[PDB]
Scaffold this active site. Structure first.
Site, PDB file in Angstrom:
ATOM      1  N   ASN B  61       0.806  -1.218   0.000  1.00 31.85           N
ATOM      2  CA  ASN B  61       0.000   0.000   0.000  1.00 31.85           C
ATOM      3  C   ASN B  61       0.844   1.275   0.000  1.00 31.85           C
ATOM      4  O   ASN B  61       1.841   1.374   0.716  1.00 31.85           O
ATOM      5  CB  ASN B  61      -0.976   0.005   1.183  1.00 31.85           C
ATOM      6  CG  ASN B  61      -0.286   0.237   2.512  1.00 31.85           C
ATOM      7  OD1 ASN B  61       0.339  -0.666   3.067  1.00 31.85           O
ATOM      8  ND2 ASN B  61      -0.401   1.452   3.033  1.00 31.85           N
ATOM      9  N   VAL B  62       0.440   2.244  -0.817  1.00 33.31           N
ATOM     10  CA  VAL B  62       1.130   3.528  -0.900  1.00 33.31           C
ATOM     11  C   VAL B  62       0.162   4.687  -0.671  1.00 33.31           C
ATOM     12  O   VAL B  62      -1.009   4.613  -1.046  1.00 33.31           O
ATOM     13  CB  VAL B  62       1.840   3.710  -2.258  1.00 33.31           C
ATOM     14  CG1 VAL B  62       2.998   2.731  -2.387  1.00 33.31           C
ATOM     15  CG2 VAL B  62       0.858   3.533  -3.404  1.00 33.31           C
ATOM     16  N   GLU B  63       0.655   5.753  -0.046  1.00 30.52           N
ATOM     17  CA  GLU B  63      -0.181   6.904   0.289  1.00 30.52           C
ATOM     18  C   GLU B  63       0.403   8.221  -0.214  1.00 30.52           C
ATOM     19  O   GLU B  63       1.608   8.332  -0.441  1.00 30.52           O
ATOM     20  CB  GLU B  63      -0.404   6.978   1.801  1.00 30.52           C
ATOM     21  CG  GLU B  63      -1.039   5.731   2.395  1.00 30.52           C
ATOM     22  CD  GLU B  63      -1.110   5.776   3.907  1.00 30.52           C
ATOM     23  OE1 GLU B  63      -1.837   4.946   4.493  1.00 30.52           O
ATOM     24  OE2 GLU B  63      -0.437   6.638   4.510  1.00 30.52           O
ATOM     25  N   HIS B  74      -4.274   1.000  -2.097  1.00 26.52           N
ATOM     26  CA  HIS B  74      -4.147  -0.086  -1.134  1.00 26.52           C
ATOM     27  C   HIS B  74      -3.250  -1.201  -1.657  1.00 26.52           C
ATOM     28  O   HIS B  74      -2.897  -1.229  -2.837  1.00 26.52           O
ATOM     29  CB  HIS B  74      -5.520  -0.650  -0.773  1.00 26.52           C
ATOM     30  CG  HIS B  74      -6.443   0.353  -0.155  1.00 26.52           C
ATOM     31  ND1 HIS B  74      -6.171   0.975   1.044  1.00 26.52           N
ATOM     32  CD2 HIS B  74      -7.634   0.843  -0.573  1.00 26.52           C
ATOM     33  CE1 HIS B  74      -7.156   1.806   1.338  1.00 26.52           C
ATOM     34  NE2 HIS B  74      -8.055   1.746   0.374  1.00 26.52           N
ATOM     35  N   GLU B  76      -3.869  -4.459  -1.991  1.00 27.82           N
ATOM     36  CA  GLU B  76      -4.544  -5.383  -2.900  1.00 27.82           C
ATOM     37  C   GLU B  76      -4.559  -4.864  -4.337  1.00 27.82           C
ATOM     38  O   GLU B  76      -4.312  -5.622  -5.275  1.00 27.82           O
ATOM     39  CB  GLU B  76      -5.977  -5.671  -2.435  1.00 27.82           C
ATOM     40  CG  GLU B  76      -6.089  -6.557  -1.198  1.00 27.82           C
ATOM     41  CD  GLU B  76      -5.697  -5.847   0.082  1.00 27.82           C
ATOM     42  OE1 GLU B  76      -6.268  -4.776   0.373  1.00 27.82           O
ATOM     43  OE2 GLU B  76      -4.818  -6.365   0.800  1.00 27.82           O
ATOM     44  N   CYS B 101      -9.996  -4.470   2.910  1.00 26.43           N
ATOM     45  CA  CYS B 101     -11.178  -3.629   3.047  1.00 26.43           C
ATOM     46  C   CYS B 101     -12.177  -3.940   1.940  1.00 26.43           C
ATOM     47  O   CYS B 101     -11.826  -4.548   0.930  1.00 26.43           O
ATOM     48  CB  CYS B 101     -10.795  -2.151   2.992  1.00 26.43           C
ATOM     49  SG  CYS B 101     -10.143  -1.614   1.397  1.00 26.43           S
ATOM     50  N   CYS B 104     -11.363  -2.963  -1.608  1.00 23.38           N
ATOM     51  CA  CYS B 104     -10.498  -3.858  -2.369  1.00 23.38           C
ATOM     52  C   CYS B 104     -11.215  -5.136  -2.775  1.00 23.38           C
ATOM     53  O   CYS B 104     -10.984  -5.668  -3.861  1.00 23.38           O
ATOM     54  CB  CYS B 104      -9.243  -4.200  -1.569  1.00 23.38           C
ATOM     55  SG  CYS B 104      -8.152  -2.798  -1.296  1.00 23.38           S
TER      56      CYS B 104
END
Lengths: 284, 285
Positions: B61-63, B74, B76, B101, B104
């Site tokens: 996951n990257v933000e 996310h 997935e 979640c 996903c």
């Protein structure tokens, strides 16, 4: 008496309508789904999804999906999210039942996890092609609790320990066209990233609206502050999208983590060219 | 630590340990969590999946600390993008660090036979295991995670999935930058709204990248074209610089239905000041 329902139906008007039909107030929900689909502003998909819910107060709320053409799909608002925003604006404390036109997507089932006792929320699907009502764990009316729809969830408890939900009295302390957008930010819900947001809008006939910002444990299923203000226009309003004028305040800490400034203007300028500026200055 | 493990290198490692490749998956979840660029949540989620080819893919996951949360990607979704770029035809198993979640689980419904995808969760606090429909190894099929779904079949009839060879036709009106973003839009997946997108990226050493556009039946769980190119940077890249130079994109001819032009620049200009123009040129619509 089954045509053009109100977006919020009073308890006295709801239980009375059910009594004349001989059914229960719970059993009245799927009867309100079909006419409510006409309210669906779906320019892109042309797929009308409506959802009518019942709170603990007895009031009946409606939820409808809206789409924004010439924008990415993540600006669109599903029917389930609309229902949550609608009853939150009316200060509804609890949500127990709702009948939806089509099977709720995972995006919305994840969003509903911000409500206390969310798995206990019974759900009925109107779509005859869908067979959730015939599950082995279904109700006597066909309702199926959200816990079964989203088992082994990823809830707020995975990021927080002992917290307040979104439907409760979320009133954090922090400090005339802009004065109304202040009280909107006070009712915001952002416990994951500490960036509340409140958005107010005016009308050509001088109608005051509101919207806030509610976060989900999953980041993407977040309800935009502008989007949560546009729901106050379609419901209890005139119903127009190119008639938006005023902008609103964004309570960032020096534009810290969750910037919605440029996204707000980008959204409004596409749906209504006659938009106004915003003031991103609020503390505490 | 590698984002893609070859079939010959994976089956060999399992053969020397005497175990299967499936039981080997959950050991790679923990170290892969370190790759998570999470400035906001500080919550590292990794997922290691196995395809039909035998190759092992990783998802993380990257933000984005200066964009709204719906721009974040996310773990997935990262995994899906990763195996599509490598041309993986199927996805059968994956072990994830935390409970996926609904965003996903809904996004994964674009794959053929998605409910049959068995899932294992590493998090001991989570109780997906010991489910009434759990495996003998603790795996749980995605169908049980998202029962009575809202799949593509609710909007479409007899169509091609997301993991197949999607090849839509489109033409146009730093020469190897737009030529690569053309074939990228050709491998896109947008059967709901007919707006494919392909995004190419360059490197300080002149490395050509690519990114699709994959649409979902549910609108919000959509995978951005820029984001799906940014996963091609975190994987098969240095790890990781947000100081790169834009770049390309192929949108519709005069913004048909789903315009992502201004939103793309808005994303890039915040993470990397050195941004470039866009190309709104595609034919055979």
């Amino acid at each position: 008496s089954m045509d053009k329902p109100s977006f919020v139906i009073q308890s006295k008007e709801a239980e009375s309508a059910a009594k004349q039909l001989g059914v229960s107030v719970i059993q009245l929900l799927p009867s309100l789904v079909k006419p409510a689909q006409s309210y669906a502003r779906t320019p892109i998909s042309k797929f009308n999804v409506a959802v009518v819910g019942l709170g603990s107060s007895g009031r009946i709320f409606l939820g409808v999906n809206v789409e924004f053409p010439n924008l990415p799909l993540h600006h669109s608002i599903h029917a389930e999210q609309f229902l949550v925003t609608n009853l939150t604006l009316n200060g509804e404390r609890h949500l127990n039942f709702f009948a939806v036109s089509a099977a709720p997507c995972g995006h919305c089932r994840q969003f509903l996890q911000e409500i206390r006792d969310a798995p206990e929320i019974k759900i009925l699907i109107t779509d005859p092609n869908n067979s959730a009502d015939s599950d082995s764990a279904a109700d006597s009316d066909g309702f199926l609790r959200l816990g079964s729809f989203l088992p082994h969830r990823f809830g707020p408890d995975d990021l927080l320990g002992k917290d307040h939900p979104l439907l409760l009295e979320s009133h954090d302390n922090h400090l005339d066209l802009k004065q109304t957008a202040l009280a909107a930010a006070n009712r915001s819900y952002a416990p994951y990233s500490l960036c509340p947001s409140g958005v107010s809008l005016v009308d050509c006939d001088g109608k005051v609206y509101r919207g806030w910002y509610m976060e989900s444990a999953a980041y993407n299923p977040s309800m935009g502050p502008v989007q949560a203000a546009l729901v106050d226009y379609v419901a209890n309003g005139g119903g127009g999208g190119y008639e938006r004028i005023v902008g609103a305040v964004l309570v960032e800490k020096e534009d810290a983590v969750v910037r919605q400034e440029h996204t707000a203007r980008l959204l409004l300028e596409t749906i209504s060219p006659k938009c106004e500026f915003k003031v991103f200055h609020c503390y505490e």
